[PDB]
């Protein structure tokens, strides 16, 4: 005698309590919550492809890789509904720390072209440490692909996936800068 199980279209981004739909640009390992209504109130969740996403019994999802996948919700009264995650425009991946040149290597030249590429990820998700995977980090300075001047000058810009704090004039050979790849 229960209602037709449903999964709310709007998700809850953990990192910034925004209640809206799954952002179109991803922070590998960012997380949000699906809200299941209808059914006998009892829920069980699971992703059809753990390589792309994962979901805990409470409905919290984690993005593991770029691609598309389905998250199923199941109630006690035998109802299964599918919430589909469509592959994002691009996705942020924090790799190893590496001098600029190495950043490019490791990333196949796919470092962020402009700073907005990383700042938008912030605006859509929040500090990366608000999430389970980056949870105990104090900083994630990231490389921003050089410009011509930057290049003749021997430096490049940077942005911080956690504290933002963009900084220009950065020595290409400084330690403590992560190779963040955009795929």
């Amino acid at each position: 005698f229960f209602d037709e199980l449903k999964i709310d279209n709007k998700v809850d981004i953990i990192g910034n309590n925004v209640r809206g739909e799954l952002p179109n640009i991803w922070l590998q390992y960012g997380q949000f919550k699906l809200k299941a209504s209808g059914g006998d109130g009892t829920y069980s969740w699971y992703s059809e492809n753990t390589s792309i996403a994962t979901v805990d019994a409470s409905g919290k999802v984690t993005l593991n890789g770029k691609g598309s996948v389905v998250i199923k919700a199941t109630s006690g009264d035998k109802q299964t509904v599918s919430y589909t995650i469509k592959a994002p425009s691009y996705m942020i991946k924090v790799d190893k720390q590496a001098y600029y040149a190495d950043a490019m290597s490791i990333c196949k030249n796919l470092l962020p072209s402009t700073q907005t590429v990383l700042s938008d990820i912030y605006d859509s998700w929040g500090a990366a440490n608000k999430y389970s995977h980056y949870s105990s980090m104090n900083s994630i300075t990231a490389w921003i692909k050089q410009t011509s001047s930057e290049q003749r000058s021997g430096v490049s810009s940077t942005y911080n996936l956690i504290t933002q704090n963009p900084l220009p004039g950065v020595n290409v050979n400084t330690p403590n800068v992560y190779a963040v790849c955009v795929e």
Partner: protein
Amino acid sequence: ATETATRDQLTKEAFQNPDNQKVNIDELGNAIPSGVLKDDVVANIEEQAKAAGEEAKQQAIEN
């Protein structure tokens, strides 16, 4: 030669301008002096030092 002295001076002045200098990053995403001068600045220093070497040298040899 004297291009050595020139190099030194032009570099000391270079360093006096916070902009000509590159910056590093500590384990907190914070800036810190690097001790290195930007590439184009270092080049333009050389150009002027060597050009000052020839200047003074080839000049003095004027008898």
